[PDB]
C-alpha cells in the first residue's frame, strides 16, 4: 500500500503543527494539522519534500 495514498494523520498529541501530505484525489501536496507525535509517512515538513517523495502517486 502506497503511503502517499493514505489520508493525513493528526495523531493523538495536542500540538497544532502545519505539515504537508500528498492528496492523490487533487494531485497536489496540501497542508494539514499534525499533533506532534506518531506521524505516519505522508507527513512532510515542506511542500518541496512532499512533491519529491510523493508527486505523481
Amino acid at each position: 500500500p502506497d503511503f502517499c495514498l493514505e489520508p493525513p494523520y493528526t495523531g493523538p498529541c495536542x500540538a497544532r503543527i502545519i505539515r504537508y501530505f500528498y492528496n492523490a484525489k487533487a494531485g497536489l501536496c496540501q497542508t494539514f494539522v499534525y499533533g506532534g507525535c506518531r506521524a505516519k509517512r505522508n507527513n512532510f515538513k515542506s511542500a518541496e519534500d512532499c512533491m519529491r517523495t510523493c508527486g505523481g502517486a
Binding site: 493528526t10 495536542x14 500540538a15 502545519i18 494539522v33 507525535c37
Partner: protein, 223 residues
C-alpha cells in the same frame, strides 16, 4: 480548548504561546528565563510570546523572546509518549509584571478530584476546526489512575494523568499542547495527548509535573 470559556485578557499571566511563524503549542513561564512545555512541541527556532491575549493582534503587553535552548527530557519516548516534557530557556529574561508572571512548581502531587485550570489557544470544536483569537480556559478535575488506565489500556505510564469529564464536551485539543494544568496555584500538568477532543470516555492525558520537579530545578540551574 473545547467546552471552555474566554479567560479574559492576561488573567492567566504564566501562559505563553510558542510560535514558529504561527502558534503551534503553549507553555508555562516558571521563572523570568524559563518555560515548561511538552517534548513533542520541540522545534528549532521557537519564539516565545508572553503577555498575549489575542494572538492574532498586537495589543500592547506582549513580549516576544526567542528560545536560546529547547531541552527535551533525556528519556522522552516518542512512541509511548513517556516523559513528555521540555524546558525552554529565553534568550533574554522576560520583564515580569501583572500580565507576565511565573507559576509555581508543585511541592507534592495532586489527588483525584482536584479541580484545575487548563488553558490555551487550541481548537474549540470537538468536530471540525475553529481556532480562537483569545485565550480559552477550562476547569476540570484530575481523574484516578484506575479510571485513566481503563480509558486507555496499556498506554498510561506513571508520568501521566487524566483530567476532564467522562461524559464528553470539555477537553484540551490541537494547539493546546505544552500548556498548563494548574491546581491550587501549582503547575501539576502539561497538555500532552488524547483520543479525539472532548469525546465520551476519552479524557485528556497530561504529563505529571510533580514527578519532574527535581529534574526541572537542576536542569534549569545547569544551563
Amino acid at each position: 480548548i473545547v467546552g471552555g470559556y474566554t479567560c479574559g485578557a492576561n488573567t492567566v499571566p504564566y501562559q505563553v504561546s510558542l510560535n514558529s511563524g504561527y502558534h503551534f503549542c503553549g507553555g508555562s513561564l516558571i521563572n523570568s528565563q524559563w518555560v515548561v512545555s511538552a517534548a513533542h512541541c520541540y522545534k528549532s527556532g521557537i519564539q516565545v510570546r508572553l503577555g498575549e491575549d489575542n494572538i492574532n493582534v498586537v495589543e500592547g503587553n506582549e513580549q516576544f523572546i526567542s528560545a536560546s535552548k529547547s531541552i527535551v527530557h533525556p528519556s522522552y519516548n516518542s512512541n509511548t509518549l513517556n516523559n513528555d516534557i521540555m524546558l525552554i530557556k529565553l534568550k533574554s529574561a522576560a520583564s515580569l509584571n501583572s500580565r507576565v508572571a511565573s507559576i509555581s512548581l508543585p511541592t507534592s502531587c495532586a489527588s483525584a478530584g482536584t479541580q484545575c485550570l487548563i488553558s490555551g489557544w487550541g481548537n474549540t470544536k470537538s468536530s471540525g476546526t475553529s481556532y480562537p483569537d483569545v485565550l480559552k480556559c477550562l476547569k476540570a478535575p484530575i481523574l484516578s489512575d484506575s479510571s485513566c488506565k481503563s480509558a486507555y489500556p496499556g498506554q498510561i505510564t506513571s508520568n501521566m494523568f487524566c483530567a476532564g469529564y467522562l461524559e464528553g464536551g470539555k477537553d484540551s485539543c490541537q494547539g493546546d499542547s505544552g500548556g498548563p494544568v494548574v491546581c491550587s496555584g501549582k503547575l501539576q500538568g502539561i497538555v500532552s495527548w488524547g483520543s479525539g477532543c472532548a469525546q465520551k470516555n476519552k479524557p485528556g492525558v497530561y504529563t505529571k509535573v510533580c514527578n519532574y520537579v527535581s529534574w526541572i530545578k537542576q536542569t534549569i540551574a545547569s544551563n
